[PDB]
Design a protein around this ligand. Structure first.
Ligand code: NA
Lengths: 30, 30
């Protein structure tokens, strides 16, 4: 339902942000 | 620097989304 759609959206955003964070850390840390 | 400020921003957003995700998971599970 609506709650499940919202939870899937949060899980996708979290996964994408964790990946962006890993790429930014690599740049900063060389 | 600028890159570290972007990293702190990602850290804040990921932590905040994880709290929203946990609160929604609890709603779903009753
Ligand atoms: Na980190």
């Amino acid at each position: 339902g609506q709650l499940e759609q919202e939870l899937a959206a949060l899980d996708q955003q979290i996964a994408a942000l964790k990946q962006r964070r890993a790429a930014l850390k690599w740049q900063i840390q060389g």
